[PDB]
Amino acid sequence: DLRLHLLLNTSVTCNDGSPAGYYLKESRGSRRWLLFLEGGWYCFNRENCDSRYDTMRRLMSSRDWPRTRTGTGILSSQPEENPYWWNANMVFIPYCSSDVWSGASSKSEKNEYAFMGALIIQEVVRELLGRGLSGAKVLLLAGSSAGGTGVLLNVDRVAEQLEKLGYPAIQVRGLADSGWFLDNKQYRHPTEAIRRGIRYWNGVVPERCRRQFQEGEEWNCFFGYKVYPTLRSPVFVVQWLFDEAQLTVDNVHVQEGLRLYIQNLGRELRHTLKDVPASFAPACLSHEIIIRSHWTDVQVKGTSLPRALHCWDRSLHPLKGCPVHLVDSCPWPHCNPSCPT
Ligand SMILES: *[C@@H]1O[C@H](CO)[C@@H](O)[C@H](O)[C@H]1NC(C)=O
Ligand SMILES: COc1ccc(-c2cc[nH]n2)c(O)c1
């Protein structure tokens, strides 16, 4: 079990002003640290944040969080469940900022809510340095869904933070699960919600990407295929080719028109990953994977996700029999027999 710690700097807060925090299980025989960002959509104005506060309050407040959480999947300490990193130090960072981990705005007399996701990540890193992170060899910042997009937005800022604090030996890397979306045409009739959100949150994006797209166009940096080329830290991308959240936003719930739409979506996703050397993209209809208990089951070309991540670790010291770029070529959901049922 991972144990809750509320942030000692109580000015770094969830949406409603309660302290943010993290859940931790230390492994004193290991110099590997895994910091996982939870997902859970977002809110973008007063009225829809108020609705979220009524029925999704754990995503906006720490007042009701439990003392412990069970580590599952990549956060599990059991070798049978986690062949990749079972002996690592484990951290689960709850998502209570509703801002895709991008915000840097405090509650005030003009702001009903605080959007502090980017600051929460940096404060967790700071407080962990006193609990053993100072001795780390590798810090892997991982996340699923909104947390996966959060990895892409924040991994280089964590690398910069540690360099500036005097820890240039810690190797910072990212693992983005189910956060790689396409700003495509919908099947039936979007990006305007992200544009409004960024202004509402005082959202921040990585430097190089912001310099490319410039003022007013920072929403572009929330799309993996546009922000990834600007990143300096190594990032492994996990994305189902027919992601359920992508299809929901596309208004897809089979005749020729829909068949061609679905096949084109898989082809476009595969194209965006052609030049991503560390990636895992199966031809399945699903959403999220890395903290699911059965994340060991899926395979692409005969290689499981835990194996591909281990091969990635070796590459950061092509490898015979140990691949790191694994993207399905078959064009319909569940043409891969190992897809989740
Ligand atoms: C607490 O966090 C806020 C926001 O990041 C920062 O302005 C302040 O300096 C921090 N306090 C300390 C003691 O580091
Ligand atoms: C699931 O996340 C998504 C998926 C798709 C879009 C999008 C934007 C324009 N077209 N489609 C998005 O903004 C978020």
Curated annotation (Swiss-Prot):
It comes from the Eukaryota. GO terms for molecular function: palmitoleyl hydrolase activity; phospholipase C activity; protein-containing complex destabilizing activity. The keyword Amino-acid biosynthesis does not apply. The keyword 4Fe-4S does not apply. Keywords: Glycoprotein, Hydrolase, Phosphoprotein, Secreted, Serine esterase, Signal, Wnt signaling pathway. The active site is at residues 145, 243, 287. Rarely expressed in adult normal tissues. Induction: Up-regulated in hepatocellular carcinoma (HCC) with high intracellular beta-catenin. GO terms for cellular component: endoplasmic reticulum lumen; extracellular region. GO terms for biological process: bone development; negative regulation of canonical Wnt signaling pathway; negative regulation of Wnt signaling pathway; protein depalmitoleylation; regulation of bone mineralization; Wnt signaling pathway. Carboxylesterase that acts as a key negative regulator of the Wnt signaling pathway by specifically mediating depalmitoleoylation of WNT proteins. Serine palmitoleoylation of WNT proteins is required for efficient binding to frizzled receptors. Belongs to the pectinacetylesterase family. Notum subfamily. This is Palmitoleoyl-protein carboxylesterase NOTUM. The gene is NOTUM. The chain holds residues 88 to 451 of 496 of the full protein.
